[PDB]
Assembly symmetry: C6
Homo-oligomer: 215 residues x 6
């Protein structure tokens, strides 16, 4: 990544063994549960495009997902080039060239070039731009791997209301990849006894009040 040192200058640092292991382990343990995305975002803080590829490449399983991600990345890179045409020809000696999509994704740019862009004034934040494309792709994967429609999250006869709502909002998060009348659906999908109580509370009731009421 690129970070500021003790002196107060933006410099390249090697990706740490702890960061590398943390990412590999969260994917192994959580697959593409929605909470994997903010972990990725946090673990890749200050990442160069090279670092982002490193993280994605260290993942051993889920190769269908990784292929889908590559497709998303390629789509975002093509769109970048459409919006930002770079002039062809030889580079001005010793000067910074303009990044293409494939340079942002780290396929055609060097670490040195990436550092050059990210530490320029003003910065051309290729790490952040690429991370946005990656997260866009990861959100599609999260939605793909969400196993259940919210329509099928219904409270069991003996299921505690707390456990039901945990399943309900877990499912909403996966189905929408953490992107924000669900309270109405929550009541509709509740079991008969809790549903009666929730109807009596009326509209405008908070989740807190509903939980208290069916507790």
């Amino acid at each position: 990544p690129i970070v500021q040192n003790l002196q107060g200058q933006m410099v390249h640092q090697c990706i740490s063994p702890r960061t590398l292991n943390a990412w590999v382990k969260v994917v192994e343990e959580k697959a593409f549960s929605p909470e994997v995305i903010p972990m990725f975002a946090a673990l890749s803080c200050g990442a160069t495009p090279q670092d982002l590829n490193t993280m994605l490449n260290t993942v051993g399983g889920h190769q269908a997902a990784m292929h889908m991600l590559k497709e998303t990345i390629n789509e975002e890179a093509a769109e970048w080039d459409r919006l930002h045409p770079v002039h062809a020809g030889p580079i001005a000696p010793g000067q910074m060239r303009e990044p293409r999509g494939s340079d942002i994704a780290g396929t055609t740019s060097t670490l040195q070039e990436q550092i050059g862009w990210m530490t320029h004034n003003p910065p051309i934040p290729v790490g952040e731009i690429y991370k946005r494309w990656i997260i866009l792709g990861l959100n599609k994967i999260v939605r793909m791997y969400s196993p259940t429609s919210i329509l099928d999250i219904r409270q069991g006869p003996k299921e505690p209301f707390r456990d039901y709502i945990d399943r309900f909002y877990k499912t909403i998060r996966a189905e929408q990849a953490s992107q924000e009348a669900t309270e109405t659906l929550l009541v509709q999908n509740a079991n008969p006894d809790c549903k009666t109580i929730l109807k009596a509370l009326g509209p405008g009731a908070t989740l807190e009040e509903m939980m208290t009421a069916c507790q």
Copy 2:
């Protein structure tokens, strides 16, 4: 987070893998036992609003609780805006804008803006303000998930007094989310034999003296 370096300047640092993992693990192991809150507060030392959202977002379970927390945050943000109206219109070029509720909660502000506020002189401590809203919400969740009324904590016939008092004060802490005649209730809820001894001690007895007496 924002910390002071070796040179003595307040700078942004990436949230560490160790911090991220620690928070995820304490929630996995302790759910919303009262001691989770001071751990959150300590692990989020110097946190930007972005960091606070990262920590909350890395939590995979407990989505009913997280939805309740969002409601609390939205309430505190609306109240902030009522007390602190920001003037609409274009920003003075190159100048710091005033934070709205949604900027404090990190939904409408950038990391750069957050850094700007928190390192300004004087600091506009958006990380600390948001953390206060979050802890307020977490305390409600702790009280919600407290499984037992203090009225139902009673010493068993063969239960050691020490074990009884551990249950008693554990329950008080959960019921009040660690926010401070309970000594009287403690005696009332004691078993017959210990209760007789505690009555003989009289009023003004310390917990230490009571424990000695029923030991």
Copy 3:
């Protein structure tokens, strides 16, 4: 905590995840065995009162003990105020106020105020003063939870002398919370065969010589 940086200035640093976890784990594994106290003292090196409360608050069990500790802290704070009366009224603008007991215990003081006192010249060491009150309270808890009188530590007929003395001095440590004719009691509580040998050695024998003799 407050520490000196590379440059050589006393600055605030966030309490580390490793420190937080270490304290929580030693309490989980050792409860209030005497060796927990020096671990607490070492892990809270340079701690502000806020840090000390953080450490105590992260403990989930042992709430009877924690309530006893609060009583000790309140007693020491009242005594502080009796010995050190602070003048009431408005503070001199921009000047350091005098700490009351509740400020030392971190209930009525801010982190900024705590930093101000601890880094003043000369320092008003509120972290160290509070830690002393806490350790005083923890020592009472260690003595409370010591399960056995030294009178009941007696060598078994087939018990190796080494194992007996380990139990003996372990018990002395707990009963006195590591605060320093026990050699005589050690002999009295020894089994018949070892006792005869130890009597023959006579007075002035070291523990080393006694162990050799009954080995």
Copy 4:
């Protein structure tokens, strides 16, 4: 490795116990699954040739693979010498000598010499050149150890499409050591029921659309 310090100078640092252990453990757990290569590349960030040999030498198993790697390294070193002949004879006193293949591979060069080349202006990046030779060799090993032809990855009658595609693209990655009408082969190797659905989608369908269709 060679890294830049807080002051902003390129200096040698000892390889860390965490780096050493991470590499040894990933080889123990993953052997030569394709994802081992980008982990190697990341863990050897800034590595001197000495560091690269250290990492390779700490591996206890897989000695057939390590012998193959040595052969690749020797081939790349011979080619280097063919392209870059070094003038024989005594060195100019106190001056930098030109690296031969065996100097790049760290068999005939000292750490001091390696540091000299890598921190020269311009740098003669012997660590990076050697790492390229090593990765070239590791890719051959990955392809050697790939256990299955893509021709034999076929969807089972009851196998979920997601699981089939995971096997498919895992195999492509191994067979090509992560070096980029497979969508056509993917359809051909699908089971009858999914194959019919995929034919109806027609050409130009994304993996995402195919997965949706056979989900």
Copy 5:
């Protein structure tokens, strides 16, 4: 401990959680096997007397050993005072006082005083002096807890020579607490068949040659 910072000045640093845990764990796992002593010496690198007491105090078991250690420390402290009499009376204002035995052992000196001595020019190395007394005491404990005389280490009829010599030199190390015609005793204690071979080798044979011969 006292260490030199990045700037190059000798300053106090808090003992680390990793150091504290390492010492506690090595004692738990190895008791007073001889190799515990050099681990103690290494983990207490740069330790103040306060740090040394912290390490010793964090040990929960082995209280007979710890009492023996205290006796050794008290003996060494009395001898220090005999050799180095300190002048009684009031201290020169703002000046360094001379350390007594109890000051070196950290019972009557403050951390500040300890820092003062250890960073003075020339340094009065109270940490190193105390560590010497402690190691002297630990060596006595190692010898006390050595379970077997070298006279009873004899090669079994079917015991491999390598395993026999491991037991032999392990025992010598414990019996002498790692303080350096044992080759003759090694032969005498060997089994008949190996003994015959070793006699044929004659005198002046190395351990290496003996091992080869009975292999």
Copy 6:
């Protein structure tokens, strides 16, 4: 060890708990498998002779090996003294004395003296010289503990060629302690069916080609 700080000066640093534990654990898990030596070399990067003795002394088992190592060290030290006679008599006040063998091995030199030599200009690299003697001794131990002659590594009738070659080159490494017509022996020791195939390939075949051929 001796390392360069942030400022760029060579200073002593305490050996880390992580380094100490890593070495102890690799010996516990791997004994004297050949890969232990490069781990030792890497973990002792920048080590003083004191540090090297610390590492060797923290090893609890394998005392026969450690005694053999001491013999090798004593041999190398005697040879050093033969080649480098030091003038006897009093030292020039405040000046650096010349290291003898026993000073290089850290038996008769202080840490201060060791630091003096290693940071002198030019450096007298006593840490590196001693490490060379130690590795020479460790290589002898690796060869001693190598359990099998390469003559007895033969491919089983049903043993996969890959597994056979792993055993073959593992054995060569141990027998030669990683110090570099074995391809011919590899073929001779192959099973009948693979041997026939390998003969047909002819001379000059790479290991890669042989593996392919018998795969």
